[PDB]
Design a binder for this molecule. Structure first.
Ligand SMILES: CC(=O)N1c2ccc(-c3ccc(CN4CCCCC4)cc3)cc2[C@H](Nc2ccccc2)C[C@@H]1C
Length: 109
């Protein structure tokens, strides 16, 4: 536990988890369910908010930056895999803007 990690849990994840655009990101991408047989060929490090949330709850992270990289990986995977005009890109951008806004007011170590 750190000051920064508590902030990431109580402020950042709390905000993103309940957001109306959060639902595609709350569990790992299921390539079979979604019919995306190339997903794991293009995206080599899958990440999602359920995984990040569980990690925060279970004190997985050693530094706040590690959690921040997981958030970043989740959004970046979405931008890399999807078509520029797909709605999910707009949903990712909306959540990430909130991520960055909140991270601007995170404690220093
Ligand atoms: C996160 C991500 O990159 N993706 C992802 C990851 C997960 C899901 C996803 C997650 C859950 C469900 C099941 N939902 C149950 C509740 C009601 C809506 C369907 C369906 C798709 C979708 C998506 C995206 N598809 C999509 C389609 C229409 C609107 C928004 C997004 C493509 C893409 C592979």
């Amino acid at each position: 536990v750190t000051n920064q990690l508590q902030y990431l849990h109580k402020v950042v994840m709390k905000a993103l988890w309940k957001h109306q655009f959060a639902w595609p990101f709350r569990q790992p991408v299921d390539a079979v369910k979604l019919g995306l047989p190339d997903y794991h060929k293009i995206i080599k490090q899958p990440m999602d908010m359920g995984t990040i949330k569980r990690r925060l709850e279970n004190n997985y992270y050693w530094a706040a930056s590690e959690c921040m990289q997981d958030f970043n990986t989740m959004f970046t995977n979405c931008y890399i895999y999807n078509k520029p005009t797909d709605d999910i890109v707009l949903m990712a951008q909306t959540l990430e803007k909130i991520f960055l806004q909140k991270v601007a007011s995170m404690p220093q170590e």
